Amino acid sequence: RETWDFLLSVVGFAVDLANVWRFPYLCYKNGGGAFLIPYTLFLIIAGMPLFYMELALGQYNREGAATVWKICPFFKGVGYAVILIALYVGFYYNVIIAWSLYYLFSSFTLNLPWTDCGHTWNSPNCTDPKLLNGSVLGNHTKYSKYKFTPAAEFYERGVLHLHESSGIHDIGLPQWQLLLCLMVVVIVLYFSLWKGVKTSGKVVWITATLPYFVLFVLLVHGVTLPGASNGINAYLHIDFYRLKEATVWIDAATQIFFSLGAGFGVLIAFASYNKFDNNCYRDALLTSSINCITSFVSGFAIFSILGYMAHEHKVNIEDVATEGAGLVFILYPEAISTLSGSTFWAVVFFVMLLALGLDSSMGGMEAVITGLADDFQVLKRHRKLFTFGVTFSTFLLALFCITKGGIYVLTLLDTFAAGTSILFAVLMEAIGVSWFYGVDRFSNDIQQMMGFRPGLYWRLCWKFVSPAFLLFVVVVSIINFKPLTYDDYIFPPWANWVGWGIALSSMVLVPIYVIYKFLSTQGSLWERLAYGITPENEHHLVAQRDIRQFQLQHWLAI
Amino acid sequence: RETWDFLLSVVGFAVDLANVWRFPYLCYKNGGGAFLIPYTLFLIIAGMPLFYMELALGQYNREGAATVWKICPFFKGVGYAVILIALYVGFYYNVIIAWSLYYLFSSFTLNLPWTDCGHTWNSPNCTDPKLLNGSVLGNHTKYSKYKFTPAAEFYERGVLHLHESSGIHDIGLPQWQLLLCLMVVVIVLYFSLWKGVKTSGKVVWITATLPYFVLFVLLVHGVTLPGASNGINAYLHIDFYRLKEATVWIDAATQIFFSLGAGFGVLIAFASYNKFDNNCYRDALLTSSINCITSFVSGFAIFSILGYMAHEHKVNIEDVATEGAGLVFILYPEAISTLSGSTFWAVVFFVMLLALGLDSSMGGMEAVITGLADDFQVLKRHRKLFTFGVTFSTFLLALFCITKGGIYVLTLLDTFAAGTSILFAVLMEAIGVSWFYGVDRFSNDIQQMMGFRPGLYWRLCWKFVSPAFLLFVVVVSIINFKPLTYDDYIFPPWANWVGWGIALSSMVLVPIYVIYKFLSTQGSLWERLAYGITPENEHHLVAQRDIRQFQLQHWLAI
Numbered sequence A, B: 001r002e003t004w005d006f007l008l009s010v011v012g013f014a015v016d017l018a019n020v021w022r023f024p025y026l027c028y029k030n031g032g033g034a035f036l037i038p039y040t041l042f043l044i045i046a047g048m049p050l051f052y053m054e055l056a057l058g059q060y061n062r063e064g065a066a067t068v069w070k071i072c073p074f075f076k077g078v079g080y081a082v083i084l085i086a087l088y089v090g091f092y093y094n095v096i097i098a099w100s101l102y103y104l105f106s107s108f109t110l111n112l113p114w115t116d117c118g119h120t121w122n123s124p125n126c127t128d129p130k131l132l133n134g135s136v137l138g139n140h141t142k143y144s145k146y147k148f149t150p151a152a153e154f155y156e157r158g159v160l161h162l163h164e165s166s167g168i169h170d171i172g173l174p175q176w177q178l179l180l181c182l183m184v185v186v187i188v189l190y191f192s193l194w195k196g197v198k199t200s201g202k203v204v205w206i207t208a209t210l211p212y213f214v215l216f217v218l219l220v221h222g223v224t225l226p227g228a229s230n231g232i233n234a235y236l237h238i239d240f241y242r243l244k245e246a247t248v249w250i251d252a253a254t255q256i257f258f259s260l261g262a263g264f265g266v267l268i269a270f271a272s273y274n275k276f277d278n279n280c281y282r283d284a285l286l287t288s289s290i291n292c293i294t295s296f297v298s299g300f301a302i303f304s305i306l307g308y309m310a311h312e313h314k315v316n317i318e319d320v321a322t323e324g325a326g327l328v329f330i331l332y333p334e335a336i337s338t339l340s341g342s343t344f345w346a347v348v349f350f351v352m353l354l355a356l357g358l359d360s361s362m363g364g365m366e367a368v369i370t371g372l373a374d375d376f377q378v379l380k381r382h383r384k385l386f387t388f389g390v391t392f393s394t395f396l397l398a399l400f401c402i403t404k405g406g407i408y409v410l411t412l413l414d415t416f417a418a419g420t421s422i423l424f425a426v427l428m429e430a431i432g433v434s435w436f437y438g439v440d441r442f443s444n445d446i447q448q449m450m451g452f453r454p455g456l457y458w459r460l461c462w463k464f465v466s467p468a469f470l471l472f473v474v475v476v477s478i479i480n481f482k483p484l485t486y487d488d489y490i491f492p493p494w495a496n497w498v499g500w501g502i503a504l505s506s507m508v509l510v511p512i513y514v515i516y517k518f519l520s521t522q523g524s525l526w527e528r529l530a531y532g533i534t535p536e537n538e539h540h541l542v543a544q545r546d547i548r549q550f551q552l553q554h555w556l557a558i
């Protein structure tokens, strides 16, 4: 097996599409710091421990996301589910890239399209804050999401053409610009994964340095804006009534698992190609810290831009922009237009966005391919044809999201395909590793790898804290489910049913695989359970009947 | 390899769902005998020769629909395409079975639902021909498909609930009755195919004798009906202006390939499990003759019932009923209601219909499984799990057809997924067998199998007549494509585009596989072509450069 070298003090999981695209609007939806508090809370007790656990497991088992369950086959279906979940996000992650690519084609012009009105895609209700005599902002200002801004009009009508679709029931025909963009994206992804997984300097060298510089420049220019004070005050304000709710915690947990890459198989695949003596402890600590800092500064800049647009458009910060997946493509272009030499900064920004998106998609596809090739070794000899199959099936399923109303399907996937299912997957993983496999054996493996055992804090998190919190958030997501909306359009009940069915398609993979393993094994019921709970490399112990999982000392070991 | 025994003088391909369900409405659409003439024409020169060719190939190669191209790998993709085409019909063939199953649940009642009006599913516009004082048949009789008949109302509103769907753009939610029916159908199909392919007496013993008796009784009762004369005259009338058209020939060719099972891989799989000394000549002759006779008598009875309903409802025969896939479920129940003891005859009829449908679906699924297991031998050791995968994927894709507007998707599949693609597949097969592989080698194989060479007629058909006619019908289908309609609703252009894309998904499998084989082989371009045109068991000849396909004598051999 090959070993990846090209690894700075902080892995690439710190800066990704989740922190630059998902975290902004996920935080803007849940007020201000009222989303930051649960974010850091689930990061210190759930996110970082599960990150460390997945990294250590991938480094010790030297296997993919699915095969690492050779120590406990009854949870191997979990290794499938997360992979499918990864594929799920691949249905809309590549589309986002396409969006940036389109913005790239809009960045080479001397006059940015999102600067003013008067274009073909713009509607008659287009309010230019810079110069507009017909602007009656002082009046007829509906208390709702302001879509009559040049950036929002260019996003929904020029890029997505949402005005040609009434809802999810009538998506229409896929836009040909987005079609060609997605084709280019999947071609680039195929030409980067077919000949094995190389260092891929093209995207790594960028994502290592350029996103930090771009975020720094954006924050420095935003704090100097006239409306920065209101946005800063809104971002630093703590709304305890939102903490009293339940959706904020679910969103924080989902954003944690998105930014840290836990629950998709990317961490396991990454650790499988690392050195056996690599210290995942310091790596996980630095990754979590830098990811938290990056999310904090990204939300700070986002709220600064929101306050600026609120001061310019004379609208409330709550209703100045949207709360969907296209919030950054409306806020950041407006801030770039204010920058001197908007063309160069826009080009650099959308080039950064493309690099982060391609990096995330490449990591996800590599995780999926590694899992399915470790499960079926034949795919290791046909990686090119296999890579084509994944990228092509992905294109056929990403066509729904590039349609005239594909943003609704994208939101449906981001809310149901990822969410309330990844939490269950990571919960089952933690239960299988700490309780079924044993937290003591995991600590012994970590000691064999790095030379030292984790502290009691990590053990209590892997065994008690994180599983309990995951079960709690899963229960509170199931009992307190809320209807999905694009902040102006309420999804129909059958759309929610389809989303729940898509989530169950990955959730039920664990009991189905349990039943399959129970029926595929030969012997008594107790012998089948022993075969399903003992490692595949120690099945001879089942012949000796010395199964530690059938002893109370195993379950009472911390 | 196992060998099937349970084979009467005429194989089960004579009486099938195509002759009892597809042929009736396909002939009623194309006038009367104006559809019979091209049917027999394509049967004597295209249908029977290709039937004999596929039977002999399956009996000689002892392989599935795809692997029989071991003599010419460049056409092996064709063996895939037909299999996919089979799967295509499996998307709507099982649904038809479900329909009959629902009718079975409607057959145990003492009062048939399709006898009169006054039910929940019936609309206010329900005209009972038996007794109705409000019947003003003498007036307000729109010159269109009469849907205000009890049988049609029970079919479209009681079974399909078509009134709740405006078109293909809004299919709605799948009906739960049809859902349970399709679940029962796929369960029965899985429990009949998992433990290998047995004789399956349950459906074979029925389909051998019961359909003939039921058709005989129906014809005898129909010829005695008062309106039988008009229907007989319409069926025996030859409309030459329809022969001057092009759609009639396409429909006749599609019905021939449906009734004979050519173009789906069922014939190859059937012949692969037969004795090596089995005479496919007499079998093909008797099969074609009995299939033609069965189609003729079925159309005769159908036109008799149409004339009866025209006499009762006082409507023209052209507009007395529909021309869709639900014509038999409207005509035959009306004739059964006139029979003495309608309950028993209805039960026997829908039991026959279920047997034929299950037999056709079992043959198609067995062909698909045999092809995919001969291509990948590993599936021979996991036939149960594989059978589940085919049946389940089939259920997930048949859900579109059991919806409130699933009849539109069913018609789309029956018109595009099967049609203009199966003709291209059988054309490529005939070209690869007669020209690339060699008609002389095929005749030598038939002589080795049966002890005698086919006549010059069969050679000229396999090499000249049938390929030319297939190319002609393919060209006339491509250049003279007509928009699809349910005789009252015109499908939108994007529906036709999706249908053409589904057809191309199977059509382009041949050039894609050609490119794949060319790129996967190592050597010069001429050596790659030689490897792609010579049999896999004679590739050593490529080393000796004595390839007969590179000689003019091979192409000029009859």
Ligand SMILES: CCCCCCCCCC(=O)O[C@H](COC(=O)CCCCCCCC)COP(=O)(O)OC[C@@H](O)CO
Residues within 6 Å of the ligand: A076, A375, A376, A505, A512, A513, A516
């Ligand atoms: C909502 C429907 C789920 C139906 C799907 C239900 C079959 C259950 C078989 C099953 O669980 O066997 C697995 C292998 O599974 C696979 O292949 C890929 C399966 C991907 C299909 C999931 C599609 C979900 C939308 C595990 O097989 P294994 O025995 O652990 O290993 C096989 C071989 O690699 C050993 O080296």
Ligand SMILES: CCCCCCCCCC(=O)O[C@H](COC(=O)CCCCCCCC)COP(=O)(O)OC[C@@H](O)CO
Residues within 6 Å of the ligand: B076, B375, B376, B505, B512, B513, B516
């Ligand atoms: C509209 C998209 C077509 C994309 C699909 C394009 C790949 C092309 C590979 C290809 O053509 O390899 C085939 C094997 O193919 C398969 O697997 C099943 C393929 C089924 C996918 C078709 C889905 C169509 C809706 C033939 O492989 P082989 O080299 O002849 O034999 C493999 C092994 O069985 C040898 O014993």
Ligand SMILES: N#Cc1ccc2[nH]cc(CCCCN3CCN(c4ccc5oc(C(N)=O)cc5c4)CC3)c2c1
Residues within 6 Å of the ligand: A003, A004, A005, A006, A007, A012, A013, A016, A018, A086, A087, A089, A090, A093, A197, A198, A199, A200, A204, A258, A259, A260, A261, A264, A266, A270, A359, A360, A361, A362, A363, A364, A365
């Ligand atoms: N879908 C999805 C999804 C969802 C939520 C997510 N959060 C985070 C992600 C993934 C983002 C990180 C991707 N990694 C993988 C690629 N990269 C890397 C570095 C050095 C290397 O070196 C070699 C070599 N020597 O071959 C190869 C090689 C590769 C580092 C970054 C994600 C993805």
Ligand SMILES: N#Cc1ccc2[nH]cc(CCCCN3CCN(c4ccc5oc(C(N)=O)cc5c4)CC3)c2c1
Residues within 6 Å of the ligand: B003, B004, B005, B006, B007, B012, B013, B016, B018, B086, B087, B089, B090, B093, B197, B198, B199, B200, B204, B258, B259, B260, B261, B264, B266, B270, B359, B360, B361, B362, B363, B364, B365
């Ligand atoms: N999809 C589709 C589709 C489309 C268009 C079509 N036209 C025609 C068809 C198929 C209808 C015929 C199916 N055959 C296969 C099953 N049967 C049979 C007889 C004796 C046997 O004996 C054994 C044993 N000893 O194991 C096993 C066994 C099986 C004979 C009938 C079709 C299908």
Ligand SMILES: CC(C)CCC[C@@H](C)[C@H]1CC[C@H]2[C@@H]3CC=C4C[C@@H](O)CC[C@]4(C)[C@H]3CC[C@]12C
Residues within 6 Å of the ligand: A091, A168, A169, A170, A171, A397, A400, A409, A498, A502
């Ligand atoms: C089926 C699995 C294995 C692969 C595909 C998964 C995703 C891409 C599928 C699963 C269910 C699908 C949805 C099911 C139904 C609808 C409603 C329709 O009016 C628009 C498309 C839409 C919204 C589909 C979009 C694509 C979708 C979300």
Ligand SMILES: CC(C)CCC[C@@H](C)[C@H]1CC[C@H]2[C@@H]3CC=C4C[C@@H](O)CC[C@]4(C)[C@H]3CC[C@]12C
Residues within 6 Å of the ligand: A173, A174, A175, A176, A179, A396, A399, B501
């Ligand atoms: C079926 C899959 C595998 C391949 C085909 C994908 C389909 C969905 C895609 C591929 C190319 C696309 C077309 C490309 C360009 C145009 C022109 C535009 O003015 C209307 C939409 C239209 C007509 C698109 C419709 C959707 C389309 C046909």
Ligand SMILES: CC(C)CCC[C@@H](C)[C@H]1CC[C@H]2[C@@H]3CC=C4C[C@@H](O)CC[C@]4(C)[C@H]3CC[C@]12C
Residues within 6 Å of the ligand: A183, A187
């Ligand atoms: C429908 C469209 C998008 C299909 C893809 C078309 C383009 C992108 C394809 C068609 C043929 C392809 C080329 C075929 C062969 C090679 C040689 C290989 O060593 C590197 C890639 C390279 C150079 C490919 C690059 C991508 C390519 C140019």
Ligand SMILES: CC(C)CCC[C@@H](C)[C@H]1CC[C@H]2[C@@H]3CC=C4C[C@@H](O)CC[C@]4(C)[C@H]3CC[C@]12C
Residues within 6 Å of the ligand: A375, A376, A377, A378, A379, B378
């Ligand atoms: C165990 C290995 C070494 C040999 C056996 C190879 C077989 C079992 C492997 C290799 C190719 C694989 C398939 C490739 C493609 C698909 C389509 C999609 O639905 C994902 C799973 C599925 C259905 C895979 C299932 C497992 C598979 C059939």
Ligand SMILES: CC(C)CCC[C@@H](C)[C@H]1CC[C@H]2[C@@H]3CC=C4C[C@@H](O)CC[C@]4(C)[C@H]3CC[C@]12C
Residues within 6 Å of the ligand: A378, A379, A382, A385, A386, A387, A388, A389, A390, A392, A393, A396
């Ligand atoms: C969704 C549809 C349209 C496309 C599906 C593409 C994927 C799932 C399919 C298409 C062709 C398939 C490949 C065909 C043949 C082989 C060679 C065999 O030795 C291992 C499996 C492997 C490598 C298959 C893996 C799965 C595969 C890549």
Ligand SMILES: CC(C)CCC[C@@H](C)[C@H]1CC[C@H]2[C@@H]3CC=C4C[C@@H](O)CC[C@]4(C)[C@H]3CC[C@]12C
Residues within 6 Å of the ligand: A183, A186, A187, A190, A384, A388, A391, A392, A395, B519
């Ligand atoms: C619409 C989107 C999904 C189309 C994507 C097409 C991609 C996946 C296809 C189109 C043509 C293909 C190439 C055609 C030929 C070759 C040369 C061969 O020696 C290696 C593979 C390679 C380089 C193929 C790689 C995959 C490829 C680039």
Ligand SMILES: CC(C)CCC[C@@H](C)[C@H]1CC[C@H]2[C@@H]3CC=C4C[C@@H](O)CC[C@]4(C)[C@H]3CC[C@]12C
Residues within 6 Å of the ligand: A171, A172, A173, A174, A393, A396, A397, A399, A400, A403, B494, B498
């Ligand atoms: C083989 C699998 C992976 C393919 C999955 C993708 C298929 C099911 C998707 C991809 C894009 C989709 C199309 C996108 C847009 C339209 C136009 C709309 O007015 C009717 C539906 C139609 C025509 C869709 C039909 C289904 C479709 C072709």
Ligand SMILES: CC(C)CCC[C@@H](C)[C@H]1CC[C@H]2[C@@H]3CC=C4C[C@@H](O)CC[C@]4(C)[C@H]3CC[C@]12C
Residues within 6 Å of the ligand: A512, A515, A516, A519, A520, B384, B385, B388, B392
């Ligand atoms: C998705 C629907 C069908 C729900 C049921 C899914 C699960 C429970 C079913 C579907 C198909 C089933 C498998 C079908 C056939 C076999 C082979 C047999 O030798 C052992 C049991 C085994 C391996 C079954 C185990 C259970 C199974 C995996």
Ligand SMILES: CC(C)CCC[C@@H](C)[C@H]1CC[C@H]2[C@@H]3CC=C4C[C@@H](O)CC[C@]4(C)[C@H]3CC[C@]12C
Residues within 6 Å of the ligand: B091, B168, B169, B170, B171, B397, B400, B409, B498, B502
């Ligand atoms: C994609 C392949 C491999 C498997 C599925 C094939 C069949 C079942 C698919 C392919 C394209 C599909 C159609 C694409 C688009 C539409 C329009 C939508 O308004 C209703 C469903 C409908 C009419 C789909 C029905 C199912 C369909 C016909």
Ligand SMILES: CC(C)CCC[C@@H](C)[C@H]1CC[C@H]2[C@@H]3CC=C4C[C@@H](O)CC[C@]4(C)[C@H]3CC[C@]12C
Residues within 6 Å of the ligand: A501, B173, B174, B175, B176, B179, B396, B399
């Ligand atoms: C996603 C696949 C694999 C499994 C689920 C299939 C879906 C499409 C099926 C399975 C069961 C179905 C439901 C069964 C019964 C009812 C009640 C009826 O009054 C309205 C429709 C409704 C609510 C159906 C909607 C469609 C449904 C949810």
Ligand SMILES: CC(C)CCC[C@@H](C)[C@H]1CC[C@H]2[C@@H]3CC=C4C[C@@H](O)CC[C@]4(C)[C@H]3CC[C@]12C
Residues within 6 Å of the ligand: B183, B187
């Ligand atoms: C969602 C529904 C339709 C799933 C299927 C449920 C029913 C039909 C399933 C569930 C469990 C199944 C049984 C499980 C095991 C066996 C033993 C085997 O030797 C014969 C079949 C038999 C007896 C199965 C028959 C079908 C069965 C009863």
Ligand SMILES: CC(C)CCC[C@@H](C)[C@H]1CC[C@H]2[C@@H]3CC=C4C[C@@H](O)CC[C@]4(C)[C@H]3CC[C@]12C
Residues within 6 Å of the ligand: A378, B375, B376, B377, B378, B379
């Ligand atoms: C050559 C044999 C002996 C060993 C290799 C087994 C592999 C290559 C076989 C066995 C299982 C197969 C897959 C099973 C399921 C699917 C899903 C569907 O899209 C049809 C093809 C596809 C994708 C098959 C492709 C080929 C496959 C992956």
